Paper text:
The monoclonal antibody (mAb) [name] is a murine IgG that binds selectively to NeuGc GM314. One such antigen is the ganglioside NeuGc GM3, which contains the sialic acid N-glycolyl neuraminic acid. Still, NeuGc GM3 fulfils the criteria of being a tumour-specific extracellular marker, which makes it a very potent antigen for targeted cancer immunotherapy. A scFv is an antibody-derived fragment that contains the heavy chain variable region (VH) and the light chain variable region (VL) tethered covalently by a linker.
Based on the expression yields and purification efficiency, the scFv C1 construct was selected for detailed characterisation and crystallisation trials. This construct contains the alternative variable light chain VLA and the L1 linker adapted from an established vector system for expression of single-chain T-cell receptors (scTCRs) and scFvs in E. coli, which was not previously used for [name]-related work. The crystal structure of scFv C1 was determined to 2.2 Å resolution. In the scFv C1 structure, four molecules (M1 to M4) are present in the crystal’s asymmetric unit, which allows for an independent structural comparison of the CDR H3 loop. The loop cannot be fully traced in the electron density of two of these molecules (M3 and M4), which likely reflects some degrees of flexibility. In molecules M1 and M2, however, the CDR H3 loops are well defined. The CDR H3 conformation of M1 resembles that of the [name] Fab more closely than that of M2, with main chain distances at the loop tip of 2.3 Å and 5.5 Å, respectively (dashed lines). Another region that showed disorder in the crystal structure is the L1 linker region, which was not traceable in any of the four molecules, suggesting increased mobility compared to the rest of the molecule. Structural analysis of scFv C1 revealed that the important CDR H3 region adopts a similar conformation as in the [name] Fab, stabilised by tight interactions with the light chain CDRs. The position of Trp33 in the scFv is identical to that of the Fab, but at the higher resolution, additional water molecules were identified.
Numbering used by the authors: 1 to 125, 399 to 505
The structure:
């Protein structure tokens, strides 16, 4: 079983540097990319970059190009991220996540199929826009519910959906508009095309209470929606 284990919470001084790690077990580390992401209090996620462990090649978001450096060591099955010139804007939860198996030779989904548990950092002494509606939505057990997602440009069906629980745990539910991931119960379904997409949950259960994110992976950098909170 795939597993990603991240390092423990740290505090730091303004102006300093720091280093955090992500240890892999239960699969061939050199066969899939590792991604890094940032999430601020009560906000959506931002994508920082990825590294290919087999070749050491890296890709970075222009917004983080002076802020972060990514590395990997194959023998110890571990990836790393280094940050510099820390400010209060840098206090956040940081995550690592694995890239899913490809679509065909040279064509990836940009769907993150397994996630680490997050590291909390405290500092103390044109992009494609996604729009999710509504921002929160209440329902009762056994109901049918649908949520909507729009992008600012044709994303040609490269649209993915994730679920985040109150304790931070993140998982992939659907990739490439309508494909279920391993272990997802078939009461989850999705549809769309062009710029307009939706997710539908049939026969709600109490373990479905959470926050839901959409994400395009047509063009770099990957961008996320701001979330829909689903409550009883």
């Amino acid at each position: 079983q795939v597993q990603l284990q991240q390092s423990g919470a740290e505090l730091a001084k303004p102006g300093a540097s720091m280093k955090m790690s992500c240890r892999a077990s239960g699969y061939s580390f050199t066969s899939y990319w590792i991604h890094w992401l940032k999430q601020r209090p009560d906000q959506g996620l931002e994508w920082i970059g990825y590294i290919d462990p087999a070749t050491a090649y890296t890709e970075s978001n222009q917004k983080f190009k002076d802020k972060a450096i990514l590395t990997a060591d194959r023998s110890s099955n571990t990836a790393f991220m280094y940050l510099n010139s820390l400010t209060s804007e840098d206090s956040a939860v940081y995550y690592c996540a694995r890239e899913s198996p490809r679509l065909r030779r040279g064509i990836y989904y940009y769907a993150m199929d397994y996630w680490g548990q997050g590291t909390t950092v405290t500092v103390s002494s044109v992009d494609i826009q996604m729009t999710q509606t509504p921002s929160s939505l209440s329902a009762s057990l056994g109901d049918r519910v649908t949520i909507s997602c729009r992008a600012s440009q044709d994303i040609s069906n490269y649209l993915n959906w994730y679920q985040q629980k109150p304790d931070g745990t993140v998982k992939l539910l659907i990739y490439y508009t309508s494909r279920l991931h391993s272990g997802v119960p078939s009461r989850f379904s999705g549809s769309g095309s062009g710029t307009d997409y939706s997710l539908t949950i049939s026969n709600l259960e109490q373990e479905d209470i959470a926050t839901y994110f959409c994400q395009q992976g047509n063009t770099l950098p990957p961008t996320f929606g701001a979330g829909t909170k689903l409550e009883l």
